[PDB]
């Protein structure tokens, strides 16, 4: 009878259900498409073609009507369909969407906003059915997206085009090209791209524009750049030439990075940023603010006993207020960015900060997949941060899980529920295999290299709690057979789920997690024997105990020597505990 509102990402700021919903007709009347945003219309056209919905030549009173346009379009038929709702009073990228009584109206605050209004439209429609809603929506953070800045195998050309379509659909508006192991980015930054590399760049810039993504071209000259004299001039002119050749293809955002280098000449670092900001960014007139990261970029490396270190203090003293400055939080890879941490760093820089969030990146621990949600990021961080980006994994497809939640966190920050965002991410990306993918991904959220790098939601916490509850019940001689039978089910389910994934996941996802899927099936088997050891020990049956103990050690040995790493502190640790 009634059309429910489906999963939405990101969560729209304001949504009221105003009716029962209706079915969109075979063909629709399209109004406002001549004056509306070129890219928004295209995104709408593609969706309609895919879903077999034609567009009428002349108006049909029986057909569903769709009206679209910006605030600054003079289209009265649009304001008429919005029913007193407006985008006029919303911040940039905001939109209004109303659907009632056979009409759908999308008014964006600007072009970007109209595009995003279409994305929400796309998510609302299921089998030609749409709910009757009144929506107004806008981002918490104005810059949201991805910095490809990890070490290891850079994403393929095909990887990036697919990512950009994915960002557009989830209202992320920033992609920073800064892969560490691209020679022309870092190692040999002075050298121009070959012609065929420039043609690939061109395709990326185009696709970025088509999806309202600000393509940021990054460059990391900090290894061997000279600062003084004729050499400093030549080296600066190399930055201009490189940035020019990309401006001339349509790049309007630029980054200059100083992370992970020997040279800690703070004054000369900023002196370069400022000159580029003057002679290039401001001179061009249509270039977004310059983005950077200092050589000291985590609170630990930046601050000492409440006060900034020599590098940080001179860097902030010199760098122009308009330049976006990035930092990673309390550590390079850390549990939290508490509100107080952003307050301190934002204080030192007397500006709104940018976040380089190092998750789900796995370059420091390539055996594990980071498949968790945004976690430990304070929900009031928008107070000191106006620019938010995640460093993803070298595995592009599986990075989508974590990025999906980053879209929701940075768009609607104070509403962000991490467990709900995580569940929705997998529900939306995995369809039929969502339930099983959750079982698997649930064990692969926490990242820990045992030394300097810790981050992410803890692995399968409910299962960890049940494991701790067992040891307590056993060592105090309480009855445990209710919990044991419950745990057998869990471990069997882990095995059942992973086998179903191996059988049914499409290649693009499977070729990125198959080794870890194998690792978890093994541990699930080691856990089952661990229980068998517990049961036999209670039964005082040495035959069944020793038999199970060998099976358990056999699984643990497979896991400890294999490249793939998963569920260290839970499924793996349980076997170790039982021995």
């Amino acid at each position: 009878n009634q059309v429910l509102v489906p999963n939405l990402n990101p969560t729209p700021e304001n949504l009221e259900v105003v009716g029962d919903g209706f079915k969109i007709t075979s063909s629709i009347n399209l109004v406002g498409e001549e004056e509306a945003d070129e890219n928004a219309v295209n995104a709408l056209r593609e969706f309609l073609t895919a879903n077999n919905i034609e567009i009428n030549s002349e108006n049909d009173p029986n057909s569903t009507t769709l009206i679209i346009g910006e605030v600054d379009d003079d289209i009265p038929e649009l304001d008429e369909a919005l029913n007193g709702t407006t985008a006029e009073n919303l911040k940039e990228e905001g939109y209004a969407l109303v659907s009632n009584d056979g009409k759908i109206a999308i008014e964006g605050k600007d072009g970007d906003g109209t595009f995003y209004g279409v994305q929400t439209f796309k998510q609302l429609v299921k089998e030609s059915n749409i709910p009757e809603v009144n929506i107004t929506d806008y981002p918490t953070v104005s810059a949201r997206g991805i910095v490809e800045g990890f070490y290891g195998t850079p994403w393929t050309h095909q990887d990036r085009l697919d990512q950009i379509k994915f960002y557009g659909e989830n209202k992320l508006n920033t992609y920073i090209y800064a892969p560490k192991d691209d020679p022309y980015h870092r190692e040999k930054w002075r050298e121009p791209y070959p012609e065929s590399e420039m043609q690939r760049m061109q395709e990326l810039i185009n696709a970025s524009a088509e999806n309202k993504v600000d393509f940021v071209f990054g460059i990391s000259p900090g290894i061997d750049i000279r600062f003084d004299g004729d050499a400093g001039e030549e080296d600066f002119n190399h930055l201009i030439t490189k940035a020019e050749s990309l401006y001339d293809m349509g790049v309007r955002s630029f980054a200059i990075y100083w992370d992970n280098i020997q040279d800690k000449s703070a004054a000369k670092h900023a002196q370069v940023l400022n000159r580029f900001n003057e002679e290039f960014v401001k001179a061009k007139g249509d270039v977004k603010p310059l983005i950077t990261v200092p050589t000291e970029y985590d609170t630990g490396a930046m601050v000492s006993n409440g006060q900034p270190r020599a590098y940080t203090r001179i860097f902030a003293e010199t760098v122009d207020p308009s330049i976006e400055v990035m930092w990673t939080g309390p550590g390079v890879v850390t549990n939290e960015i508490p509100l107080s941490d952003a307050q301190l760093i934002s204080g030192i820089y007397d500006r709104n900060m940018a976040v380089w969030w190092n998750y789900p990146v796995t370059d420091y621990f390539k055996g594990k997949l980071a498949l968790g949600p945004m976690h430990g990021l304070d929900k009031g961080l928008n107070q000191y941060v106006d620019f938010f980006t995640v460093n993803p994994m070298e595995h592009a497809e599986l990075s989508k899980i974590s990025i999906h939640t980053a879209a929701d966190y940075s768009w609607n920050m104070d509403n962000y529920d991490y467990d709900k965002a995580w569940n929705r991410a997998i529900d939306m990306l995995y369809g039929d295999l969502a339930e099983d993918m959750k079982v698997f991904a649930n064990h692969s959220t926490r990242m820990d290299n045992k030394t300097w790098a810790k981050s992410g939601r803890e692995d399968a916490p409910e299962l960890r709690a049940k494991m701790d509850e067992l040891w307590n019940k056993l060592s105090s001689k309480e009855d445990a057979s209710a919990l044991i039978e419950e745990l057998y089910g869990e471990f069997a389910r882990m095995e059942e789920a992973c086998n179903n994934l191996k059988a049914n996941l499409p290649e693009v996802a499977l070729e990125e997690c198959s080794r870890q899927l194998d690792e978890l099936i093994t541990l699930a088997q080691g856990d089952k024997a661990s229980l068998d050891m517990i049961v036999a020990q209670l039964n005082e049956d040495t035959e069944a105990y020793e038999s199970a103990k060998e099976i358990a050690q056999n699984k643990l040995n497979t896991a400890l020597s294999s490249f793939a790493v998963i569920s260290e502190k839970v499924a793996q640790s349980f076997i170790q505990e039982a021995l």
Partner: peptide, 4 residues
């Protein structure tokens, strides 16, 4: 292959 990583940050220090």
């Amino acid at each position: 292959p990583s940050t220090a």
